[PDB]
């Protein structure tokens, strides 16, 4: 199960960073990470992208922990392509796992599909995510996501749709 | 004797140390692989040192190997220190170590899980030592007679270890021999501990510094002696490595470090009839080792007295029995005084350090004799790489031993420095000490005449 | 007297030598003989590692039994003496007719893969424990539709897999099993009858001691894992009471010191108590059972979108490539393997000590009184190295205040003892301390070592 060629994954043309900012939900996850269709998908979490004056994104993962609403913050620096990104806080140490975030296709209104890669010294991993503005997207987008994931070689079982919980990702609790 | 030479060399080198050393090396090696590497390196360095000593013997043919060489070389105060340290340190401590080994092997079956009482160990060691010194004093006939049965017991123990090791490597899966869990197992290697590992491994190789010249009788010693030295020591090293792998196959390395008698536990794990074979055979081996050490120490006392450094009180053979009773009594007293250490392996370090401290000195003397006073007829010559590499290793050993365990080694150095002044008193007296010393000596001689 | 003195001294020397021999024999007979070692079954040594969901444990790995052999090197690094593979047998949710306990699920692998895995584990000295819970994909582990058929198929599967070579089994969620103790006794005695080195673990969610004791009444040689210590309590006195109550009610029989059934420590415990509870579980008298990921303190709520029941094992920062930067370096196996002070390193050290020390393996356990908030006890064998563990479950720095005279004099407390390791930094290992005035930091655990008195 090798990493796909970067050329094969599409890119979003005329990528407008201003529109992409906001709170995306995760409505599908494809990748050889350990999750399978048969088992528990998990609890849906949200990713908040805030655009900065230097065009770098501030990314906040919010999810529901044991009892605390849990948050985590990172920063994406724009890559070579307008729609590509890389994890910020780069250091010369080879131990760091370079990241190759890449937006595959989005209408900026209700859905998006993005591709992540985590090339590492001893490992090369990738994943695809179906971001959505609402808790649940229409079935057609899920079918398109499954087709695109299968294009990269991921079996059907590797694709997972987290349960749309109504606490922390949306509201308080 | 083209072939018997290898036999005599192997018999002199191979002893009971293999029954006590293996816990010492591994305990400091930290892994089975490092243990076997230490054994191999010690074997090679012993080959080098024996070769240098053979060269020195051919260049300086004189009785008292390792003493005459250090006497004719370095002038005075060097050979006297060799004799002083050999009498005070090396022989009493070798006898004490072998006696403690006998006691540990005798008592291991009775207390397999927990330390036996220290008083029991010391009493059994003293019992063995006193019986052996008595049999040596009474007559040399019995001393040479019992050596056959003791050597037979030692050979039986070694042969059974080797056989039960080769059987188990086929079916025992050799879990620890393979690199799986065979390196960096107990602790990360430390050079300070590796020096102590080499000191304890060298204890297995003994009786080559002085027994490779005093005993050689070859048809063409110049032609054959280098061959014998090069072909007898390596097979001894192979035997030691085979014994170590047999131990590690029979028992886990952790189980080997908490035994105090490696062969007893080996026989327990493998031999169904264990107690009837291993402890008794090793006890015979230790008896033979102590008896041989006693005979050799008395022989050394003979030359020590003849050279005039020692008083005539010693090295006096009894008339009815042709035995050096006064020489044996002093070694017995010194060994009994050494038997209050309570540590089987501390003594090993304490002796090995001194052994190396003088082996290196002798090799340095060889180098000096090469550089200064050359052109001497040397029937067999050695490439100057071997002595210098030996010296390099010797320096490492000493430095790191002092870095790691500066107490036992320090005490040995202090003993040597305490022996240094006596030589001046012997050589030059600013004022003759006729008030006490002479009278004391006379009284001692009189008493020796009266009771012995 | 000139010649008479010679013979007199010679015979006096022989008399003294014989007196020394008699004294040696007397001392040997007076010495205390070593106590026999117990029947140390393979699971009495070291911990057990419950792998649960293999697909989650391997993460980016293959996800099948054939791919599980890659991790056996890591598990050997942990020095766990056993594995509890999740239920691999083929199962249709809530269908007793369509579930078979003798067929491996196609997704998990094939029979040949399982045989190769068992061979490799045996080569590495790891022993597999196949858990045979009939309905592991359903809401209730034991089908409600039928009872007798489920037990019959479990017995048949136990026979078949014992023939295959598994070194034991495990049965979970027994609270839902009807007529549990009888079936447990039957399965346990059949498994022991096949061979002595074969354990049957039992899992319950009950936290009441009386229910556990009733379950153990029929068979006293059954390893039971239950949520008994799961209640955090947050008081050392409470945990001390739980441990002593259980040990003295069960009769000091061998027990499994697992914090739960098929759950991680991080579900019950907060982040700051993981090291303390690891020390306690590794030093208490029994066989600690750890769910996978407990060595790195894996928490299902630490990362977004991670299943609560079966969190994905974090082997490196690329374990989740969908959330860049969320998986910090120091919450992974690779990150914590390079840190001398980390939960994984502490787990490795404690497992090593548990596996090799003859006082922790099989040794008497005696807890004694400390100022309230402290759980302090001693593990000691016969004239062997003794260990003393002092745990500060409170959140306020407390003077240890050890005062233990009720303990046997054979395990008397010396004035000083080494410091084998501390859960928190700030102390020098190997330095003897003053037990009379030993200070303890909040949420700190000290493992001290002292030798046999003589
Ligand atoms: C185990 O005990 C049960 C009790 O119901 C019995 O039926 C079965 O034969 C026993 N099996 C043994 C002792 O192997
Ligand atoms: C534990 O098992 C009992 C028995 O079926 C059940 O009633 C209960 O809901 C379970 N959960 C807890 C937390 O006790
Ligand atoms: C166990 O300990 C408790 C502590 O309260 C005590 O009441 C009980 O009698 C003890 N039982 C046994 C058998 O030791
Ligand atoms: C190390 O792990 C702890 C978890 O106890 C976490 O709080 C801390 O942030 C981690 N280190 C860094 C640099 O984030």
Residue numbers in the entry:
A (entry chain C): 8 to 180
B (entry chain B): 41 to 492
C (entry chain A): 177 to 630
What does the paper say about this structure?
We overexpressed the human HAT 4F2hc-LAT2 in the yeast Pichia pastoris, purified the protein in the presence of detergent and solved its structure by cryo-EM at 3.2 Å resolution after complex formation with the anticalin D11vs produced in E. coli. The structure of 4F2hc-LAT2 with the bound anticalin D11vs was captured in the inward-open conformation as evidenced by the large cavity (red asterisk) facing the cytoplasm. LAT2 is covalently linked to 4F2hc via a disulfide bridge. The 4F2hc-ED sits on top of LAT2 and forms a complex with D11vs. The overall resolution of the final cryo-EM 3D density map calculated from differently oriented 4F2hc-LAT2::D11vs complex particles was estimated to 3.2 Å according to the gold standard Fourier shell correlation (FSC) cut-off criterion of 0.14339,40. Local resolution analysis of the map indicated that the highest resolution features (2.8–3.0 Å) were located in the substrate binding region of LAT2 (S) and in the interface region between 4F2hc-ED and D11vs (I) (labels S and I in Fig. 2d). The high local resolution and quality of the cryo-EM density permitted modelling of D11vs with high confidence. Interestingly, three defined densities were found in the substrate binding pocket, which we attributed to water molecules: H2O-1, H2O-2 and H2O-3. In our structure, H2O-1 is 3.9 Å apart from the amide nitrogen atom of G57 and could thus correspond to the location of one oxygen atom of the carboxyl group in an amino acid substrate. In order to support the existence of the three observed water molecules in the substrate binding pocket of LAT2, a set of four all-atom molecular dynamics (MD) simulations of the 4F2hc-LAT2::D11vs complex was performed under near physiological conditions. The persistent presence of water molecules at all three positions was confirmed with occupancies of H2O-1: 59.3 ± 4.3%, H2O-2: 65.1 ± 4.5% and H2O-3: 52.7 ± 11.4%. No significant structural differences were observed between our structure and previously reported 4F2hc-ED and 4F2hc-LAT2 structures.
The human heterodimeric amino acid transporter 4F2hc-LAT2 is a membrane protein complex that mediates transport of certain amino acids and derivatives thereof across the plasma membrane. While CATs are N-glycosylated, LATs are not but they associate with type-II membrane N-glycoproteins from the SLC3 family, i.e., either with 4F2hc (SLC3A2; CD98hc) or with rBAT (SLC3A1), to form heterodimeric amino acid transporters (HATs). Light chains are polytopic membrane proteins with both termini located on the cytoplasmic side, which function as the substrate transporters. Anticalins are composed of a central eight-stranded antiparallel β-barrel backed by an extended strand and an α-helical segment.
